[PDB]
């Protein structure tokens, strides 16, 4: 009762102003994604040259997926952390996450920086079409 009657004086809201971040933060998120895509490309080129060495207990396909997922996950988390740095004290998403009433750091990260990798059945999106995920992509594309 008492806190809800104080909330009439203070008030709470959620708006687009909360989702939007500083321009510098957007540039940092974009740079993280750029270098991550480059790293995935380097891993792919190593795999094509057969320079990649299999992880013990794993096939070369499995270890390639492991390394690619590690690079993408690190980029995803780093962009999320940059977005969470950008949040001001007044930001209401942060109010709800810090108080614990609803939401999580992951939700803020997806709202502001990067939605993240989509995984189905524990793997990246599979090749539903013949050797490609969607008709628009080129055959044998393991890129991000």
């Amino acid at each position: 009762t008492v806190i809800n009657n104080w909330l009439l004086i203070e008030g709470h809201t959620i708006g687009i102003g909360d989702s939007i971040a500083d321009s510098k933060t957007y540039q940092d998120i974009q740079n993280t994604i750029k270098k991550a895509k480059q790293d995935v490309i380097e891993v792919i080129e190593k795999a094509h040259n057969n320079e990649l060495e299999p992880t013990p207990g794993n096939t070369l396909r499995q270890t390639f997926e492991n390394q690619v997922n590690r690079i993408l996950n690190d980029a995803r988390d780093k962009t999320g952390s940059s977005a969470q740095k950008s949040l001001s004290e007044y930001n209401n998403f942060k109010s709800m996450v810090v108080s614990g009433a609803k939401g999580s750091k992951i939700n803020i990260s997806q709202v502001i920086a990067v939605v993240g990798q989509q995984n189905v059945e524990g793997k990246r999106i599979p090749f539903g079409f013949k050797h490609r995920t969607l008709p628009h992509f080129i055959k044998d594309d393991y890129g991000p």
Partner: peptide, 8 residues
């Protein structure tokens, strides 16, 4: 929808 270790 996040990653392989998270949720879909």
């Amino acid at each position: 929808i996040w990653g392989i270790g998270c949720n879909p």
